[PDB]
Amino acid sequence: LHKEPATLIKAIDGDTVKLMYKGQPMTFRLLLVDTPEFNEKYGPEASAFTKKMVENAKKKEKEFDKGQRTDKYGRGLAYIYADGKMVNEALVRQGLAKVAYVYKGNNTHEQLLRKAEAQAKKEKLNIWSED
Ligand SMILES: Cc1cn([C@H]2C[C@H](OP(=O)(O)O)[C@@H](COP(=O)(O)O)O2)c(=O)[nH]c1=O
Ligand SMILES: [Ca+2]
């Protein structure tokens, strides 16, 4: 896999972002993760985290995996990076996303994200909290 430039149009929520890809406005869905919807618990927090992490980065990048690059809803499927740090991983590490939607052939960073999730569980963060 390799990173390539991502052109941000706007934040959407914890696990989707609007990108300009080859001059087409597209919703991109973060691979291997699931954030709460905005109106669910930790939804506002995941939204805010993803929004700021991407907006504040001078270098915004995306990385396709080896399998499908769009889902059945026409959303792009990628890992997103903000100054070299993977958004998908950071969400999971902070307990604002679960590892989810793991499909063989688009699962290159699965182990990386499950490591992060186990630490978020150990720390009882957010999704994994007693709250
Ligand atoms: C992350 C991801 C979601 N999806 C589909 C699975 C789910 O479809 P079903 O909708 O038919 O349940 C849906 C979840 O998206 P959201 O979590 O954005 O709602 O998107 C993929 O097909 N590929 C993926 O890599
Ligand atoms: Ca979601």
Side-chain angles (χ1 to χ4, degrees):
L1 307 189
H2 73 274
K3 299 184 192 58
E4 58 189 277
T7 300
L8 177 67
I9 295 174
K10 61 175 167 142
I12 303 167
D13 75 354
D15 63 19
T16 57
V17 291
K18 201 77 185 199
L19 299 184
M20 189 77 83
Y21 184 46
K22 302 187 51 44
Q24 306 305 334
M26 286 184 66
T27 296
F28 270 67
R29 179 65 165 84
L30 276 58
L31 281 169
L32 295 191
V33 305
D34 186 42
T35 51
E37 287 285 327
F38 179 75
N39 290 312
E40 319 182 298
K41 196 176 174 63
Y42 308 108
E45 289 80 11
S47 289
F49 188 85
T50 297
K51 177 166 188 299
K52 294 191 168 130
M53 185 169 176
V54 179
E55 280 180 0
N56 297 337
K58 296 114 293 185
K59 194 167 44 174
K60 314 172 208 296
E61 296 175 296
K62 62 185 179 281
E63 181 179 55
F64 295 104
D65 211 317
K66 286 165 181 218
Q68 71 163 204
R69 299 181 164 205
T70 57
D71 70 15
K72 66 193 170 176
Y73 297 119
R75 301 183 301 177
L77 295 174
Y79 305 105
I80 305 297
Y81 295 81
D83 292 335
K85 300 305 170 284
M86 195 199 307
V87 178
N88 314 47
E89 177 186 14
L91 285 161
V92 171
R93 179 64 179 86
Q94 298 303 316
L96 294 170
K98 295 192 185 178
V99 175
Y101 299 102
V102 183
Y103 302 106
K104 56 257 85 95
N106 259 353
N107 71 342
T108 294
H109 298 311
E110 182 182 357
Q111 192 73 345
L112 170 79
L113 265 43
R114 288 199 186 284
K115 180 176 158 104
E117 195 189 76
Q119 293 264 65
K121 288 179 180 157
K122 181 173 180 88
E123 299 173 359
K124 298 186 227 296
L125 302 178
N126 289 314
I127 289 167
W128 311 119
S129 68
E130 297 289 327
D131 292 308

